[PDB]
């Protein structure tokens, strides 16, 4: 017993929400970068390559077994918002094996 909620930070982090019904642990961290439309030298971000400021990772159990796209396809909140932010992002999971 110790809830630690987690409000709207971005539309991606809705996706985990779903998530939460079911029992397991879910980290999402969504960092982004807003384009300055009065344009300095801003709106030029563009230094990721593979640095990602979006990762999803969802442990359940913590014993890796199942593919790990089979979970991400039930929240389909990757690669949506850091792409607006113009870095990329890295999804795990980790579940007990579906064949039990």
Same mark, same amino acid.
């Given at each position: 017993?110790?809830?630690?909620? &987690?409000?709207p930070i !971005?539309?991606?982090i #809705?996706?985990?929400?779903? !998530?939460?019904?079911s029992?397991?642990?879910f980290? &999402? ?6 384009? !300055?439309g009065?344009? !300095? *030298?801003d ?11 979006f *990762? &999803?990772?969802?442990?359940s159990?913590?014993? #890796?077994? /199942?593919t790990l796209v089979? *979970?991400?396809?039930l929240?389909y909140? /990757?690669?949506s ?5 113009g &870095?990329?992002? /890295? ?7 579906a064949?039990?």
């Amino acid at each position: 017993m110790a809830e630690h909620q &987690l409000g709207p930070i !971005a539309g991606a982090i #809705k996706s985990k929400v779903e !998530a939460a019904l079911s029992p397991t642990h879910f980290k &999402l961290i969504n960092d982004s970068h807003k384009h !300055a439309g009065h344009y !300095a *030298r801003d709106g030029s971000t563009a230094s990721d390559a593979g640095e990602t400021h979006f *990762r &999803l990772e969802v442990t359940s159990d913590a014993f #890796k077994g /199942l593919t790990l796209v089979k *979970r991400h396809q039930l929240i389909y909140g /990757l690669l949506s918002d850091e792409f607006k932010a113009g &870095l990329h992002a /890295l999804s795990m999971t980790t579940k007990t094996p579906a064949e039990q």
